[PDB]
Design a protein around this ligand. Structure first.
Ligand SMILES: CC1(COc2ccc3c(c2)ncn3-c2ccc3cccc(N4CCC(N)CC4)c3n2)COC1
Length: 296
């Protein structure tokens, strides 16, 4: 009985099959900077000639616990494996300097800014943005999240800003700094003291700091609202304050975006069930969207 346990991927050794020499890595422009650190475009010569990649790194002032967390994220990505709809791990630099995590590069950037740029040219039916594209995006994000859940992982920051768009209109979930394997407890209780994405969070995460497969599903529902509203900020007209929390707890939910199909707003509503047990799984969401695509 006690001779069997769940292998914790963050306790496994770093596998040097990922190691890439930093003297073949040339940094280009900065792609983003924030609590996650710094992300740059780069060329990784000979990782496969020259492929364009993204490289995540910490600020030079970073704490030892920040540095350990980047190593832990590397181990999580190493254990997770490859999927079409995530920003995949390609390599790392783990000695001779600060840790660098090398991942796929997505030339169109984040989906939120993409949507906000294409808002004015959007037309529901027929390059330009159409209802068909938005359904495809909903499907691909659900497939990436189903994959994470099939590996017993939660992302904890699902939002349009953390979805990237690459060639062929393929969407990829990015930023795994907060992702966790929850095989042992079937939840995660956040002990951190960082700023949190309150308007994307399930009420049980706000109130009790508990994260689960089902709280990722809540966030997916908020993502759907962002998507079909073409990049509107969620809960318009509502600051994050005592009024906001009271309303969410009492059962307030956002109305449908104008261009959301009724069956997609139906998914949103089940993602936001107050009872986590009544929310759908990503597996169920994928099957639902599949059938909507086929019926279109
Ligand atoms: C639009 C252009 C392209 O932009 C980009 C941006 C990030 C790009 C990118 C192309 N390929 C990849 N990544 C990544 C990769 C890992 C990341 C790990 C953590 C955080 C990230 N980001 C993106 C979203 C987040 N909300 C803010 C920081 C990350 N990004 C073409 O010139 C910019």
């Amino acid at each position: 009985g006690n001779n069997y346990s769940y292998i914790d991927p963050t306790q496994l050794p770093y596998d040097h099959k990922w190691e890439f020499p930093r003297n073949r890595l040339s940094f280009g422009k900065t792609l983003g900077a924030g609590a996650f650190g710094k992300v740059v475009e780069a060329t990784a010569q000979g990782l496969i000639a020259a492929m364009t990649v993204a490289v995540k790194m910490l600020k030079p002032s970073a704490h030892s616990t920040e540095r350990e967390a980047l190593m832990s994220e590397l181990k999580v990505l190493s254990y997770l494996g490859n999927h079409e709809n995530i920003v995949n791990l390609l390599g790392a630099c783990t000695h001779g300097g600060p840790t660098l995590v090398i991942t796929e590069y997505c030339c169109y950037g984040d989906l939120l800014n993409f949507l906000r740029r294409k808002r004015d040219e959007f037309v529901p039916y027929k390059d330009f943005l159409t209802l068909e594209h938005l359904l495809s995006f909903s499907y691909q994000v659900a497939k990436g999240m189903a994959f994470l859940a099939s590996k017993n992982c939660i992302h904890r920051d699902l939002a349009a800003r953390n979805i990237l768009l690459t060639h062929g209109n393929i969407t990829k979930i990015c930023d795994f700094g907060l992702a966790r394997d929850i095989k042992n407890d079937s939840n995660y209780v956040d002990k951190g003291n960082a700023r949190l994405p309150v308007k994307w969070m399930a009420p049980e995460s706000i109130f009790n700091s508990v994260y689960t497969f089902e709280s990722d599903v809540w966030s997916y529902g908020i993502f759907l609202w962002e998507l079909f509203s073409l990049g509107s900020s969620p809960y318009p007209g509502m600051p994050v304050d005592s009024k906001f929390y009271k309303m969410i707890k009492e059962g307030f939910r956002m109305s449908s975006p104008e261009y959301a199909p009724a069956e997609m707003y139906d998914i949103m509503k089940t993602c936001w069930d107050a009872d986590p047990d009544k929310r759908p799984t990503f597996k169920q969401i994928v099957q639902d969207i599949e059938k909507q695509i086929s019926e279109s």
